[PDB]
Design a binder for this molecule. Sequence first.
Ligand code: Y8I
Ligand code: Y8I
Ligand code: Y8I
Ligand code: Y8I
Ligand code: SF4
Ligand code: SF4
Ligand code: SF4
Ligand code: SF4
Ligand code: BR
Lengths: 419, 443
Amino acid sequence: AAEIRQQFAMTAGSPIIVNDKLERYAEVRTAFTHPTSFFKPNYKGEVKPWFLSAYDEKVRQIENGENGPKMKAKNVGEARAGRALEAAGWTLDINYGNIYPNRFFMLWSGETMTNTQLWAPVGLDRRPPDTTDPVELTNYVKFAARMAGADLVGVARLNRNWVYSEAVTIPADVPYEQSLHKEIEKPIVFKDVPLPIETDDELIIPNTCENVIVAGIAMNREMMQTAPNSMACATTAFCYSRMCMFDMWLCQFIRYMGYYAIPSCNGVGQSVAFAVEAGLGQASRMGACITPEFGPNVRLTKVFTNMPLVPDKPIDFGVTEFCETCKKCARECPSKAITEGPRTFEGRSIHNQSGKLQWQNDYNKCLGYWPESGGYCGVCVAVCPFTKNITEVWDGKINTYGLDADHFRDTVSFRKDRV
Amino acid sequence: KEKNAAEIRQQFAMTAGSPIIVNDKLERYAEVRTAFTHPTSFFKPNYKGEVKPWFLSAYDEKVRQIENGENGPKMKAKNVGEARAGRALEAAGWTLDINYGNIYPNRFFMLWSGETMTNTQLWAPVGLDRRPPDTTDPVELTNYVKFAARMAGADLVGVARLNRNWVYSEAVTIPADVPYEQSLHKEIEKPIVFKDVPLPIETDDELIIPNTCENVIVAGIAMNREMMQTAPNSMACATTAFCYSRMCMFDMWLCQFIRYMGYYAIPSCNGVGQSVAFAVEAGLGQASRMGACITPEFGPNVRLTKVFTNMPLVPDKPIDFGVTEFCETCKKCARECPSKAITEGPRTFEGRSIHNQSGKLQWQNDYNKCLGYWPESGGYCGVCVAVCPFTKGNIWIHDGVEWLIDNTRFLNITEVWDGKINTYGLDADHFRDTVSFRKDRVK
Ligand SMILES: Oc1ccc(Br)cc1Br
Ligand SMILES: Oc1ccc(Br)cc1Br
Ligand SMILES: Oc1ccc(Br)cc1Br
Ligand SMILES: Oc1ccc(Br)cc1Br
Ligand code: SF4
Ligand code: SF4
Ligand code: SF4
Ligand code: SF4
Ligand SMILES: [Br-]
């Protein structure tokens, strides 16, 4: 796979085409959070926050021995098991995505972490960097990223166009039990300051924050192929906890090297754009970043840092041209969310960021199918050619973290492919 | 014939029964007696002769090595930047671990109930932790829980009935009102007792495990071979450290799955009881001269954690693939040990010192001598693991009829940073060893 990636390397330069209308995008506009999309009826006709309506459908399916919408399970025991696996997968994730910056697991400084306090006598986080060479730092930090659970890792210069204009967060002293009821907006700004810092009014990223490190965290193929049923929910969930552990591990390594690091998971900015600029893959009709190793069946997280690094080259292995004629995801999508038309610079609704050339999809239509089906769908990922019953999954092949030994050698790494 | 770990385990399976041989002087072991915690072993000199808590003396040596451009004792790094990078990797590995091992029960990550966890609160409307189990069949439960264990990062997973002999008589913990920044100064002992109660519970006086807590699930978490072979230097410390955070994630993930199936679950990592003995009884491997559990897939180069539960399960069979007989003639770890902690003599029932639990047949090692080498070397050593022939990736051969051990096996850090790596430090040349189907999860 290291041969393929260098064969398809582009010359330097962001491959996302923009016009002069593009503005940074307020995170509150996503379908998950925006008031126009947030409330959906359950199967009884009661309007609730969308994820609560989806909970009601999970309960109804368990009671009726189903693994998904009109998908009978082997028995009620099997239906329960898939939802127990899904729920457990989310253990290391706050409120579905860890999006609040500088809260809970997503701290912008390591100073208060238990690990940092235990290691304080060594002083790694206070000691100036011993390495400033971007070539050596790129090799060190990619090695560390693989130790930290990334299946893919890439580096790009930080394009501020993809950083949210304002983040969704909670006040710093609000306890977890009131968090969902007290979400607020807060601007993300760049200023001449030494370190990332949060004031009462602003999330402040330093102007020295030059780079973003993007990780790809592979999902399980057999489980995602059960979309829109529960086992596709389970591989999604487990990878969100893998994302959180990756951010914390890598931020701690970068801090202990003498630099600062900002974790993010699903917060701070748009992962698909960063992933394309870092060379992990190409944008697609469904909207995801499609990778040569995994297609779109991979989750993304990212870390921002002033650590000197060598940016990776973007890659072109023909996704744009394949998506022009394929349209399989658009035809299988249960909610008709994915367009069959051509790419434009004009968003279809508030949930899209206008000003960038992309396939414009209706993401309120997508979210609307989640309470109906009681899961996170994923049909588009499952049917995509680049990605290539539930009892057979539970009785079938599995390996550590759901990785597959039949393909795991595609992500082996030596120095030559790290820098 | 190409390697097959399921075949190897089937060939060397033994009939049911704890393989560990015990006599009448066996008593449960107070966790405070470990060398990490006991007053007789806790204090060690640093390189200036100052007597400190052992891990602070080791800190002093780490700082000294970075300043002198060293990756380990008298091992020169490429430069100071490389020395710094190895210790930064090591320190970051420990991010999801409290005070080196997560040993305090029902504190921090090791909660004995899920009710207060953020994930449980988020999922409360579904009621999975309050709904009675929909499956009580131990066969199906074993398949489900082992599948979940592999999702949760276990490279090996096994089940045994819980043997209370290996549960610590008293735990090392902290009072519930002590915050993290004073934890190291306020450690106490607290008894672990078994009583007729419905759920695991902690009182001011006791940690109470229910009499219904029938089973223990043991996980192996594979370390990286290239990094451990640098023992006693810094990169061996780093693969150790990352695997402790993997252990913690495993426990939390699996306990939540078990709870959401309608049962209770107790995490432990390095706490609650003796991992090697549980691992032997659950069939992950055999005890060895060095004292670790040696597995067919990884040798001793694998970490262990375990979860206790009332969930009905099918215990696995123990395995005997000849480790005892190899250790009887090998002695490589004993001869290479930089502190001479590992005995070259026979197994006995008599502990060498307070750190050993007497009354069980094992090789008796001086674990105060081992720990004394850690401040000297600035790390967690691991030379015994590195030199053990079972840590080699290719010890197994097939003779056309069956599998056997290759007896011939018993006769630098810059290149590691520049060399092969893959997700979580796993090795794709060997990752097929741990593929799993229903047939090898439950019989
Ligand atoms: O990104 C997500 C946010 C919330 C839920 Br519920 C599922 C996903 Br996937
Ligand atoms: O006295 C101490 C100071 C720092 C640490 Br880290 C541990 C102890 Br004990
Ligand atoms: O088990 C351990 C406890 C403390 C340290 Br420091 C290292 C290990 Br390995
Ligand atoms: O009102 C609520 C009740 C339970 C949960 Br979980 C989330 C909300 Br918002
Ligand atoms: S997740 Fe499902 S509903 Fe959403 S776009 Fe994909 S196929 Fe359509
Ligand atoms: S299914 Fe086809 S059109 Fe959709 S993202 Fe995949 S390749 Fe592109
Ligand atoms: S860790 Fe090192 S000092 Fe300890 S027993 Fe093994 S070889 Fe000896
Ligand atoms: S080095 Fe030899 S004696 Fe020591 S544990 Fe390994 S096989 Fe046994
Ligand atoms: Br202490």
